[PDB]
Amino acid sequence: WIIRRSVANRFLVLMGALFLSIWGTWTIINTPVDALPDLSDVQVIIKTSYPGQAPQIVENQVTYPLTTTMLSVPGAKTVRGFSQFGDSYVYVIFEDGTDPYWARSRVLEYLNQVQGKLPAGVSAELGPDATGVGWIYEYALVDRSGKHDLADLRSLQDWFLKYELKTIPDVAEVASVGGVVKEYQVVIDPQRLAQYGISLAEVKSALDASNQEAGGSSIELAEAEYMVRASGYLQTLDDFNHIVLKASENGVPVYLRDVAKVQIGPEMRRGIAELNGEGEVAGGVVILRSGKNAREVIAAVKDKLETLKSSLPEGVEIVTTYDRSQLIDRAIDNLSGKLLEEFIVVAVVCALFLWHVRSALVAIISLPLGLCIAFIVMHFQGLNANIMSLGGIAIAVGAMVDAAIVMIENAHKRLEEWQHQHPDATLDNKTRWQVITDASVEVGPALFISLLIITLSFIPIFTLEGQEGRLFGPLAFTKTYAMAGAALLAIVVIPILMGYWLNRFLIRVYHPLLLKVLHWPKTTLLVAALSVLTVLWPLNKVGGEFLPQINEGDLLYMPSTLPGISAAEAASMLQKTDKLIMSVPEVARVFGKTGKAETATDSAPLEMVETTIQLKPQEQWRPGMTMDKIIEELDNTVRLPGLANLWVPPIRNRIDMLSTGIKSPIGIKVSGTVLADIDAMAEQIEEVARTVPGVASALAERLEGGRYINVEINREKAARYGMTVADVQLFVTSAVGGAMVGETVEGIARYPINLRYPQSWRDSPQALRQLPILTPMKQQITLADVADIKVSTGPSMLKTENARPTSWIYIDARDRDMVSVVHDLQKAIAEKVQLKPGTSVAFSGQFELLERANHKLKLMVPMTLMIIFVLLYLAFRRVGEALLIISSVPFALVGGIWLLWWMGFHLSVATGTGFIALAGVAAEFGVVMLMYLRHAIEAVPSLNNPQTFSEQKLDEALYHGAVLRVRPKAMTVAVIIAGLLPILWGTGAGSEVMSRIAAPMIGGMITAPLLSLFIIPAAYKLMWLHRH
Amino acid sequence: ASGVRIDPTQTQNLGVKTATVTRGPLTFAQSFPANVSYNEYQYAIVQARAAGFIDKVYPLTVGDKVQKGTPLLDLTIPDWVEAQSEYLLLRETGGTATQTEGILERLRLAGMPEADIRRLIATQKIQTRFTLKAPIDGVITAFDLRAGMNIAKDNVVAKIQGMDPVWVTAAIPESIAWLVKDASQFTLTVPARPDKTLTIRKWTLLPGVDAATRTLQLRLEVDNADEALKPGMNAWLQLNTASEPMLLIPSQALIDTGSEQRVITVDADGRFVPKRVAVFQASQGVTALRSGLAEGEKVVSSGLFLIDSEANISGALERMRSES
Amino acid sequence: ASGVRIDPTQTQNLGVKTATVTRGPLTFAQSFPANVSYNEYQYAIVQARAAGFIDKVYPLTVGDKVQKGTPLLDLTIPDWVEAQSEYLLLRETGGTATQTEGILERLRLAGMPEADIRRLIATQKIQTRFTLKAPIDGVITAFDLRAGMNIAKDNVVAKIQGMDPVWVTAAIPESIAWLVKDASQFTLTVPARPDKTLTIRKWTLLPGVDAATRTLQLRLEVDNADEALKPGMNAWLQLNTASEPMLLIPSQALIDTGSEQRVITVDADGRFVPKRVAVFQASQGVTALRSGLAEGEKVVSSGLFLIDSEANISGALERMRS
Ligand SMILES: [Cu+2]
C-alpha cells in the first residue's frame, strides 16, 4: 500500500522528524501541568441573605421559588437547596459539556424574572466562577509576639491580602476564613432609656443620621472651582458618644453616651479557624477559576507572597495549611520517572534480544518521536500534562516499540536468506535497499491495521459520560495519539532508519509442548476453556470500587454531630479535636474549621466541621506505618461522645460533593414531603448501618432538631400600649438580637455597627419575659406584657434536592471494600426498615457513580467486539478467522483477573479500562500470530495439501509458523509485561490508579500469548480440515 | 439498662464538668431605675402671717440651698400695732397680769410670731419691721416675692424642701409586682457617685401604682449628710428575693426542648443517665426545679450537649421515656 | 480505646495582645453647654402701695433698659388723703410734738413712701399724685400697666432685673458629679464674643440637677460693665482636668455583661485567668477600677475572645479555667 511511497521520500522525511523532534522538545517543556484532568461538574450557586427570618419562612419565600425556576433551566442536571438561618443557598448543577459561562448567563436572566417574586429586602447574590474543588492554597495568619490580634488579622486579610491576591489571573475568588470582624457595639441601657425618656426606635433613627457625607457642589473663586465637601463620617468613638438624641430649648442636649456605652467587640462569627490545637486564627483560601491551571496559579501566589513578606506588620507570619502544588509535583515527578523506567527497560530488553547496536537503535528512536507527536497533538487539542494524560503515554509505551520491532524482526531474518542463496562478500546500497523494503511490506498490512485496531477497539471508552470520562478521557486521547503516531511513523521513518543503520534455549522448551498440542488438537482447546473457568472463580473474592483510593499528602476530617450545637461549643469541640489530631506523630499541621468561609462555595453550618490535615513527608512516618494504618490511630485517638467522625481526601471530597453532595464515599438519601417521616426513616437506616461488618461512622443529619425561643406576640396586649406588631419586634431584633444597623466607612474598609441590650437581659427565656420595654406612651413594661415566649423544637436546616426535602446519611467504611458494604446495606435496609408512604430511599455518593459507569461499560463491550470483528474481517476476509480471534480474547481477559486477586486489587473503572485495552492487545497478538500461519499456507509444502492430503505437510506449516512467532512473541510479550511491570506495585504518589489500570493487562498479557500460542494454531489445523 | 456508658478518656478530653444537686430558695435578682428626689416630710412653705410690704429681699433665688435660719426677707406688718400700743400703755398704767396676758393672747392667735412677741416684752417697743427666716435646712424650690412688692397671706415667700434623709423612688412594672416581697433585699447605686456606698434607712411599697407609667412606686429613704445625692439624679435599685425552697441546679445543666425538660444524671459507676425534671423558675445563672431529682445527685454542666447527644443516639433517651 | 489525654481547657498560644494594670489619673477634657441670664439677686417687682388710677405712663415697655430713678408712671392714690389732713390739722392747731409723729408714722405704715411723706411736711399740702421710678438699673422684663387703666396692689408696673454682674449657668452631666465637686477652674467662652473668653475660678454647684436632661447646674457671675454678654446668649464652659490616681486598665479589656464586669488576666505562666473587678468609671478609652486587680497585673485587652452573636459569657469564661 503506502510503504511503497515511503522509501522514495527518503530525504525530507528525515528532516520531517528532525524539526518534529526539535519542535516536539519545545512543546513538551511548555505544556501545562495538573494532578488530574479537572473532574468537577459545572455548577452555579445563588447565595441569599434573608436576615432574621426563620428557616421555614426562608425556604417558602426565598429558596423554594428559586429551585423551581432553576430546575426547568436549559441543561440543568439537578438543583439542590439550602435554607439555613438567614441564609439561602441555591445549587444549580448542569449536564455534561454544558458551557459553564452559558449556564451562568442563563441563570442571570432567570434571576431577573424571579428577583420580583421575592421578598423586598432580598437580593440573589450570584456565586463565584469556581467551585469547592477550586480550593488550592490555604493559609493562616498568626502573630506570636502578641502585637496583633484576631481582629487586626482579619482586617489585614480582608483589606490587604484578599486584594493583593485576587488580582492574580486565573483566580476567581480569595475567601477569608475565621478571625474577628471588629464591630462597633452600641450597648443600650434599658433603664437609661426610661430615665432619659428616649425610646429604642428613637436611638436607631438618630444613629441612622449621624454617619454620612454631603456634596455642596462647587463654588468659583479666583476663576477656580472650589468643591464644597461636608463632613459627617462616623470615625471616632466620641462621634458615636456625642450623637444627638434629644435637646431642650435651654440648649442642653442628651447624647447617645447618656443611654448607652459604645464599645468595640467581635461581630457574629460566621466560621471559626484553629491551628494545631493551640490557637484560634484568621486565614484565607485561594479559589481557582473553573477550568484554569491549578499549578500555574499557586506559583504566581507564592512569589506574590514573598513580595509581601516584607510589607507585613512586624510579627505577622503566614503559615501555610494546604498546598496543592505539592501533590502536583509528587504526581508529575512520578509519571515522568515511570516513563524513564519503561523507556530504558524496553530498550535494554530489546537490546538483549537484538544483538545489533543499530537494530536496537531503530526501535529506540521509536520512542522520542512517538513522544513528540503525542505532545504537539495535545497542545492543539487542549490537553495538559496530568497523571491521567501521562498515564496514557505510559500505558502505551509498550506497543509503540511493538510497532517498530515487529517490522525490524521481519527484516533481520529476511536478510538471512539473501545471504544463504547469494554470496556473502558482495553487496551495494541498492542491494541492501531491496531486502529491508520487502520485509516491511509483508508485515505492513498486519501491523498498521492491528494498531488501527488497538486504537479503535479502545475508542468505546470516550462514551464514558461525566467524571470518569473526564478522567480516562485524556488517557484515551493520549494512548491513541501516541499509538497512531508510532503507527503512521512506522510507515514513514522506521523502515528508512533501519535501512540506514540465547534464542536457542527457548525454542527447545516450546516445541516439545507444541508438537504435543497436535495430539488430538480438539482436546487442548477444551482444557483451555476449562482453565478459563478455573480462572473465572477469582472474580467472586475481589471487591468493587468506582475508582482506586488515590492518596494525596493531606486529608480532611469531618465529624458529624446532632443539629443543635452552639457556635461557642462547636469552636470548643474543634480545638479539642485539633489537639488530638496533632497528637499523632505523622501529622505536621492541623487547620480546623467550623461554619463557613467568606465564599458562596462553602455553605457549612457551625455544627459541622472540616479540618485540613497535613502529614509529614511520607518518608518520616513511623516504621511500618501506612496511610491506612495512620487513619486507624486517628479514628481511634480522635473521638468525642455524641460525635461520628469521617476521614477523607481533600480533593476527592470537594468533588464528591459537587457530583452528589455527600461527604463520605458511602451515602444514603432519604427524600420525603413530610420532615417527620424522612427523619424517622433516616434514623432507622442509621441504626442498621452501624451493625454492618465493616462500618465505623453512621450519622444522618436531622431535618428538624433546631431549638427555638419564640416570642408569640399578642396583638391585643400590644395594642393596649399603642404598639404595632412591628413596634414590639424592634426589641426582638435589635434589643435582644444583635441586629446590624449600619457600618463605618474606614478608608477602603468597612465595619458594622449594632444596637443591643447588655447580655444579662437576654440571658434566658425567663429574662426575655422581663425584657424592659419603654412604650410609645412612656409607660414602662416587660416583653411578657405584650407577648408569650415559648421554647420549641423545629426545622434546623430545610434541605431540598429537586424541590423535594431530603436527609443524607453519612457512612464511613474503610476496612472493607465499597461494593461489599453498599450491598450489605441494601440487604440490611430493605428487610428491617419498612418504608412509609411518601418516603423514598436511594443510595448515592460514589456508588451512584458506579451504576452510571457500569451501565456504560456493559453497553460498551458488544460494540468493541463488533469493531474487532470488522478489523479481523477487513485484513483477513475470513469469517471463521475473525471468530477464532474473538473467541481467543476471553482467555486474555481471564488471565488478567488472577493478578487483581493476587495484588489484592478491586474492580474499578481503572481496572475495567485495563481490560478493554488488554483485549485490544490480545487481538493485536492474535492477528500477528495468524499471519505467520496463513502465509505458511502460501508456501509450496502447504500448496500440496489442497491438491492432495498430507498429515505431515500440515504439521510442518504450523511448526514453521510457530518458529516464525517465538521471536516476535518473545519481544512483544516481553516489552509489554516488562514495561508495564514497573508501574504495577502500589507505592507511589498517584500510582494508586495507574497500577489498578495496569494489572489487568499484565496478568492478561501472560496467559494471552502463553495460551494463544497453542489455541489459535491447534484451531487453524482443525478449521482447515473442515473445508476439505 | 437505662443510661449510656462512655469511655472516661473521652469524657476527660471533653473536659466534662459536673454539679451537685442541692435544695434551697432561689434568689431572684432584677434591676430597676429610680429617681433621687426631695424628702416630702422636710417640706416648708413660708407664708406671711399678715399683710404688708417688702422692705428687704436677701440674696436668694429659686435653686439655692438655705440653712435653717437663713433670712429670706424683711416686711412691715401694721396689723399688730393697735393691740401692741394698747399693751404698752397698760404697762405704763400698770394693769393686771391677767389684763396683760389677755392682750399677748389676742396678739398670738392673730398672727404675730411668738418670737416677735417675746421681743415685744423684752424691749417694750412696738414691733413693725419683721424678718422672715428659713424654718428648716433645705433647697429653695419657689420664691415669689422680690423687692418693691407687697406681700399677702396667700403669697409664698419661700418653699423650702430638704434632702438630708433623701428620697429615692424606684419604678417596678406592675406585672412583676410579686417579686418585691417583705424580706426582699435592696441595694442602691448612683452613677454620679461611683465612690459612694449608700445606706438605705428604710423602704416602702406605696399603696397605688403610677397610671402614667403602669409601675408600682418603691420609696427608699437614704442617709445623705454629705449631700452627694442631688435630687434629679438617676439611681439604680437592685433587689434580691428568696423564693420557696426548691431543688437547685446550674442552668447550663438543664436541657429544654419545649415539650420536655431534662438533665443528665451521672451514675455511681459513671453511667450517664438522662432524667426528666420539671422546672419551676430560674434566675441569675441558676434554675430551680419543682421535681425530678434528689439532693446529692450529680448533674453534667460542661460538655452537656455532646453527652446528651451520645445518650440520644444510643437510644438511652427513647428508653428514659418508655420506662415511665 | 486510646488512653491518650489532652488539655480540655481553651488555649491561645498563637500570640495575645496584653496590657498591664497601671495606677494613674483619669484625664478629662469636655465642653459644657451654658447660658447667659439675668442676675436673680438683682430683681425688682414694682407694685403700688395702694389702689388708684394711672394719670400718665412714661415712654417705656418690655425689653427696655432702665436705670435707677427712671420714672415709670404717675398715679393718683386717695388712700392717704384722709390722714394727711389729720396731720396738717395738727399743725394749724399746734398739736403735740408726739401727736404729730403719731399721725406721721401711721401714715408710713399706711404704705405712703418715706419720700412722699417728706414732700407732705415740706409743702404742707396733701399729696395725691405720685410717681413710681425704677429702683435699680436693669432690663424691663415686664410692664403690665398702660395709660387709661386703674391700678391695684397685686398689679405689677415693672419687673426690672439687672445684668451687670451677669449670670452664666452650665449643665454638667450627672456622670462626673464625683469629679466636678473637686474642680479647680473652668474656662468660659461665649460664641457671641471671641474676646470675652476668660478663666473662671469661683462658681457655685447647685444642690439640684435637671431631670429632663440629667445634668448638674453650675452657676457663675461675670462682670458685664460694657453690657457685652446679653442674657439669652449661648455660652460654653470648658473643663480640662485629671482625677486622683486609680487602678487603670484598657477599656477593651473589661468584659462586662448587664450585671457582671470582669477582666481576663494573664498570670505568670501565661495561662488565662478571669477575675471579677469593680469599675469606678472610664474616660478616653481607659476605665478605672475600684477593686479586683493589683498594680502591675497582666490582662488581655480583648472582649474579642467570645463570639458576639451568643458566646454566653459565663460559660465562655469558664471554658478557660480548670
Ligand atoms: Cu462536609
Short mmCIF file of C-alpha atoms in Angstrom, two decimals, chain A residues 518 932-962 1017 1020-1021 1024-1025 1028:
data_model
loop_
_atom_site.label_atom_id
_atom_site.label_comp_id
_atom_site.label_asym_id
_atom_site.label_seq_id
_atom_site.Cartn_x
_atom_site.Cartn_y
_atom_site.Cartn_z
CA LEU A 518 -1.03 -31.54 17.99
CA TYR A 932 2.55 -16.48 10.25
CA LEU A 933 0.21 -19.47 9.97
CA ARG A 934 -1.86 -18.31 6.99
CA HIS A 935 1.22 -17.36 4.98
CA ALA A 936 2.67 -20.72 5.96
CA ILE A 937 -0.11 -21.94 3.68
CA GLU A 938 1.02 -19.71 0.81
CA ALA A 939 4.21 -21.78 0.71
CA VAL A 940 4.54 -24.78 -1.62
CA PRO A 941 4.51 -27.52 1.05
CA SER A 942 1.07 -26.26 2.06
CA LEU A 943 0.10 -25.82 -1.59
CA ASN A 944 0.49 -29.59 -1.76
CA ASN A 945 -2.32 -30.06 0.76
CA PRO A 946 -5.15 -28.54 -1.33
CA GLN A 947 -4.05 -30.74 -4.24
CA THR A 948 -3.57 -33.87 -2.14
CA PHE A 949 -3.86 -34.53 1.60
CA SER A 950 -0.83 -34.84 3.89
CA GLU A 951 -0.74 -35.40 7.65
CA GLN A 952 2.94 -34.41 7.58
CA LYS A 953 2.80 -31.28 5.42
CA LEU A 954 0.09 -29.60 7.51
CA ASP A 955 2.06 -30.05 10.74
CA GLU A 956 5.18 -28.52 9.19
CA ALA A 957 3.47 -25.33 8.02
CA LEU A 958 2.32 -24.95 11.62
CA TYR A 959 5.76 -25.77 13.01
CA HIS A 960 7.26 -23.08 10.77
CA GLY A 961 4.62 -20.57 11.86
CA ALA A 962 5.40 -21.36 15.49
CA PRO A 1017 -2.64 -22.85 15.89
CA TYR A 1020 -6.30 -23.46 12.22
CA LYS A 1021 -5.33 -27.09 11.61
CA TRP A 1024 -8.53 -26.20 7.60
CA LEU A 1025 -9.79 -29.79 7.72
CA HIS A 1028 -11.56 -30.22 2.93
#
